[PDB]
From a paper:
To demonstrate the performance of the sample-injection device, [name] experiments were carried out using LCP-grown microcrystals of the human [name] adenosine receptor (A2AAR) complexed with a non-xanthine antagonist, [name], and on hen egg-white lysozyme microcrystals in a grease carrier matrix at SPring-8 Angstrom Compact Free-Electron Laser (SACLA). The sample-injection device stably extruded microcrystals embedded in the highly viscous carrier kept at a constant sample temperature.
Of the hit images, 10 510 patterns were indexed. The indexing rate was as high as 97%. The HVC injector with the cooling jacket successfully prevented any sample deterioration, including viscosity change due to phase transitions resulting from changes in temperature, allowing us to keep an almost constant hit rate during the 114 min of data collection. Moreover, the sample injection under atmospheric pressure did not require the addition of 7.9 MAG or 9.7 MAG to the LCP to prevent the transition to lamellar crystalline phases due to evaporative cooling.
Numbering used by the authors: -1 to 208, 1001 to 1043, 1060 to 1106, 219 to 308
Amino acid sequence: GAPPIMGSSVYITVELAIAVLAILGNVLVCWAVWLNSNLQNVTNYFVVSLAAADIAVGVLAIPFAITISTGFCAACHGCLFIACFVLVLTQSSIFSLLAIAIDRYIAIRIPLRYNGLVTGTRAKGIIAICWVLSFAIGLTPMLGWNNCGQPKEGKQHSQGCGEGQVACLFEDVVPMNYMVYFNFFACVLVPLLLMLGVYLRIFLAARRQLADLEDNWETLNDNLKVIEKADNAAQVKDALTKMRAAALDAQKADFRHGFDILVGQIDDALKLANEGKVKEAQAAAEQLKTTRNAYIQKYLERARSTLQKEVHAAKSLAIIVGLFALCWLPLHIINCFTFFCPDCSHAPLWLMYLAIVLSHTNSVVNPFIYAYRIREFRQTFRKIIRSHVL
Ligand SMILES: CC(C)CCC[C@@H](C)[C@H]1CC[C@H]2[C@@H]3CC=C4C[C@@H](O)CC[C@]4(C)[C@H]3CC[C@]12C
Ligand SMILES: CC(C)CCC[C@@H](C)[C@H]1CC[C@H]2[C@@H]3CC=C4C[C@@H](O)CC[C@]4(C)[C@H]3CC[C@]12C
Ligand SMILES: CC(C)CCC[C@@H](C)[C@H]1CC[C@H]2[C@@H]3CC=C4C[C@@H](O)CC[C@]4(C)[C@H]3CC[C@]12C
Ligand SMILES: Nc1nc(NCCc2ccc(O)cc2)nc2nc(-c3ccco3)nn12
Ligand SMILES: CCCCCCCC/C=C\CCCCCCCC(=O)O
Ligand code: NA
């Protein structure tokens, strides 16, 4: 077999390349939020917490990963910290992603109550709690759920470690039942499915409110034609009363002026209809068309635009969650095979390190998603680049 130093030279070189890109891209994200006040909102404070975790992958997790690949001799609990620190960062990322999804769900479901419920001070408290919990979850093996008590004696002496020390290799010290049941199923898979559900509910909420808007508009147009071809006064009254309710639920969901005019003109044409005079009620109802073409349509178009922007923004953030799953699932699935099929040959070492490298590349991608999908980030990236390096 080829000397190990050659394959490991490739692995280390790729890891360092990834580390550099992870640091630089995510520093740019934090720099962007710091300088641009329009990026300083609660949503982007979770983005920054996420960027901080990805910087930490480059500065600490990748160096740790290089170290533990050598199988060096170490006190088992020190090795455990080297092996598990990345799990703290991945857990922090999951909490940040989950918080962003819930944030966007609150924004679209109760926007009038959003800024009252979701504040920067409460968000900062949530970020601190999530980091603390990330340390507890990621370092649980250090509390005793580990195989430090059953060291591999052959590797210990073949590597020449003193006693009290282990050959520091991930799968020798971190139990597979922890990685599969606790880390993967409970701490990764369940939150991922939760976020899938929240984003589904976001798109459904946006679709329902768009439909409601269109319904109210066609209800105001349909009943206009009804009034224009009516003949009994009860006819005109029935239609006008269905326009008033439609006009009010649209009011809830200088346009306060446009609707005052609309409601007033409906009330006018309504009191005429109650008095029997229909032709003058129809005449009064036909001026609604200019209030509609002058105010209501304009507001219904920008309400449509706002929802479309929220949906497009929700899609961009959902892409972040999908790429997280794509980059981390292979390693988890491999662990499932190692754990659940003792009759299977272990995944080959080159595939293990490909899966590790892939998980680390996730710390590089998010800055690119922001620049391509989010105008405010893209433009802030441009200004920073063209001004502070050229
Ligand atoms: C930059 C600062 C904030 C963080 C860096 C701290 C890192 C380098 C420190 C903190 C704890 C340290 C570990 C503590 C215990 C051991 C066991 C020993 O047998 C080998 C070294 C080893 C594995 C240390 C490696 C270095 C280590 C991981
Ligand atoms: C998108 C998410 C929900 C997909 C997660 C599905 C994972 C848990 C599934 C997909 C393929 C499955 C593996 C397929 C084959 C085997 C071999 C069998 O001898 C042990 C179970 C084992 C190892 C399965 C474990 C569970 C597994 C890894
Ligand atoms: C891109 C993501 C979503 C899907 C990738 C699925 C990958 C991780 C799956 C597809 C085929 C799987 C391999 C199929 C066969 C074996 C041989 C067995 O003795 C060890 C596990 C091992 C080596 C599996 C490891 C996991 C594996 C490589
Ligand atoms: N199984 C596993 N192994 C490693 N590194 C050890 C790779 C290895 C595996 C077997 C072997 O004989 C020599 C080396 N890192 C790992 N990281 C993870 C992981 C992180 C998050 C989810 O899974 N799993 N995982
Ligand atoms: C400024 C950020 C500092 C970055 C710190 C990262 C440095 C790499 C950390 C771990 C390498 C040290 C572990 C090597 C122990 C080998 C001891 C031995 O010979 O057994
Ligand atoms: Na991350």
